[PDB]
């Protein structure tokens, strides 16, 4: 087995299947769990980013870390295309977990709320889509989720979209975003992602814009004075430093 600080043992066979960077990832995710903070797995796509979550959750359940005796009920929000992909992935890389799909396709064939309750009681891994999160913020946000992974989490990049608010209604600190590109147009998107994972780190949205987005943007324009270039440089470095612990971008 592989052992980390307090009680985290991930099975050795599982660990050996991973790469070195994926192992680093698993360690990083567990350090966050210790802090009770969230993070963004900003690995460039194709780098087997999803496998890291499997390994980490597997290790956490296996270690039976101490409300919850190891891994509680958890929800995975991922784009509609990849739900069965994730189901497949859990099934191969760790059969023991129950991975219920929440979708019209699904596998339940009853009312959905019964399925939500079932997973929240039997401590499964409820996969769902951003739509069903937007549409059942009421039902879903009544069950003490342990982990709230968002795959391709950039879809929460609009702080005012409904889906964003719904995703930010979840209460647990163990929020994770798996986003190949956690910033696509401007930093307002970044702030939004951080406000899901770590609600206070970057401040309020107005303050973030005032302090970071404006200066960092103005330093990119061709006509910007060198002074403003250097303010942008400063602010950019501050931002990287602020977000360093909580973003793992290989």
């Amino acid at each position: 087995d592989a052992e980390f600080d307090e009680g985290f043992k991930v099975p050795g066979f599982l660990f050996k299947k991973l790469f070195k960077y994926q192992q680093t990832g698993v360690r990083w995710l567990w350090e966050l769990h210790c802090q009770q903070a969230g993070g963004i797995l900003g690995d460039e796509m194709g780098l087997g980013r999803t496998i890291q979550i499997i390994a980490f959750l597997a290790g956490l359940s296996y270690s039976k870390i101490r409300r919850f005796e190891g891994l509680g009920p958890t929800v995975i929000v991922c784009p509609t295309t990849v739900m069965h992909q994730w189901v497949k992935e859990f099934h191969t890389w760790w059969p023991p977990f129950r991975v219920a799909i929440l979708h019209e396709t699904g596998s339940y064939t009853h009312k959905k709320e019964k399925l939500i309750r079932d997973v929240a009681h039997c401590h499964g891994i409820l996969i769902t889509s951003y739509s069903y999160i937007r549409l059942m913020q009421d039902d879903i946000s009544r069950y003490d989720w342990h982990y709230v992974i968002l795959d391709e989490g950039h879809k929460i990049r609009n702080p005012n979209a409904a889906v964003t608010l719904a995703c930010k209604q979840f209460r647990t600190p163990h929020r994770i975003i798996l986003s190949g590109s956690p910033m696509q147009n401007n930093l307002r998107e970044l702030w939004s992602l951080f406000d899901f994972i770590f609600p206070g780190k970057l401040g309020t949205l107005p303050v973030f814009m005032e302090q970071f987005s404006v200066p960092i943007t103005m330093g990119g324009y061709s006509n910007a004075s060198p002074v403003q270039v250097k303010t942008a440089y400063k602010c950019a470095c501050v931002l990287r430093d602020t977000i360093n612990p909580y973003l793992l971008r290989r």
Binding site: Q35, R171, F198, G200, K201, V207, V238, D241, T242
Partner: protein, 365 residues
């Protein structure tokens, strides 16, 4: 005592006994030393004092006039009478002097080379002690009531800042990141204090009568909200769980960091278990404060019994922390007392007050 010297000498008692018992005896004998003075440099009231944690030689002092004075507390003259001369001073002419009242001033723990000072000009300035130039300035949108650096953090170098905003700002002195905020208070935060025991535990007290302990690493809000009654009056927490029946304008962890002392404008002091915020029901009687800003008070260290020195109007009221028995009230100031700071090496107390004086209390004989 000669029993104490003989007991130390013969090994009957651990020398720890003589140290702590004598340290206590010295604290009980605190009296206004007219055989010691502090040089008058503040034109306005002293809001804050800070003796450096390593070597306890120097004291910072922040005035209502905006100046920061840096005193030397060692008697370098051969006389038995001396004035604690002022080494440096952020005076009226310093380009970086605060525009309004300096509300807090703090030595960087782990090193005397840097200190920080926050004011009503909405700035927390970091100073290089040697060159006495600002190394950094954090601007806040709202006047700063208090800040505090962790006395224990070898790892993080966050400054918790309480402003009139309802939010607690964490300023990372390592690469300057003043974005992080703790949310959950509703009115001005009048006092913040890091745990001396836990690296990332912060206690913040606010005018909404609530005190919250935070794990700033944690991304999920306050750990604990101190509740006067511990549950006798229990309500779905939206307005209940008040530490006090007024504003809570003072915080101080006891030395070992296992208890928290809060003073609020209901004229009470309470002692809280810092682990589960449970009220220990220590009485302390009535502690007059009506300060509209933070009230800086300290505890003793390295005595047989712990003491807390609280400004009580124009006096320093000394209490035994764990029993509440008021030792004495040190009467030597002329106006209300704003801050007292404890010199742990010699059981000396310095207290500033609105009458522009800093009085030394040293044990008698």
């Amino acid at each position: 005592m000669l029993g104490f010297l003989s007991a130390r000498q013969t090994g009957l008692e651990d020398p720890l006994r003589l140290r702590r018992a004598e340290s206590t005896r010295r604290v009980l004998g605190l009296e206004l030393n007219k055989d010691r003075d502090v040089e008058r440099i503040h034109g306005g009231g002293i809001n804050t004092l800070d003796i450096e944690p390593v070597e306890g030689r120097y004291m910072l002092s922040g005035g209502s006039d905006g100046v920061i004075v840096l005193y030397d507390l060692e008697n370098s003259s051969r006389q038995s009478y001396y004035t604690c001369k002022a080494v440096c001073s952020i005076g009226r002419d310093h380009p970086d002097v605060h525009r309004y009242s300096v509300e807090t001033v703090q030595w960087y723990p782990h090193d005397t080379g840097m200190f920080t000072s926050s004011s009503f000009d909405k700035t927390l300035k970091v100073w290089d002690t040697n060159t006495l130039q600002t190394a950094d300035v954090f601007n806040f949108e709202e006047t700063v009531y208090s800040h505090h650096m962790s006395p224990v953090s070898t790892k993080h170098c966050l400054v918790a800042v309480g402003t009139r905003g309802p939010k607690v700002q964490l300023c990372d002195l390592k690469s300057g990141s003043c974005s992080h905020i703790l949310q959950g208070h509703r009115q001005e935060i009048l006092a913040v204090s890091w745990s001396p025991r836990y690296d990332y535990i912060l206690a913040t007290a606010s005018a909404d009568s609530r005190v919250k302990l935070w794990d700033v690493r944690r991304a999920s809000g306050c750990l604990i909200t101190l509740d006067q009654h511990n549950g006798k009056k229990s309500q779905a927490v939206e307005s209940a769980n008040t530490a006090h029946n007024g504003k809570v304008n003072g915080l101080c962890f006891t030395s070992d960091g296992l208890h928290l002392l809060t003073v609020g404008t209901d004229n009470r002091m309470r002692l809280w278990n810092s682990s589960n915020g449970e009220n220990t029901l220590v009485n302390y009687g009535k502690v007059c404060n009506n300060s509209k800003k933070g009230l800086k008070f300290t505890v003793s260290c390295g005595c047989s019994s712990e003491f807390v020195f609280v400004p009580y109007g124009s006096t320093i009221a000394v209490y035994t922390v764990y029993s509440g028995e008021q030792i004495t009230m040190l009467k030597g100031h002329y106006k209300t007392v704003d801050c007292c700071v404890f010199q742990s090496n010699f059981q000396e107390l310095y207290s500033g007050s609105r009458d522009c004086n800093i009085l030394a209390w040293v044990p008698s004989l």
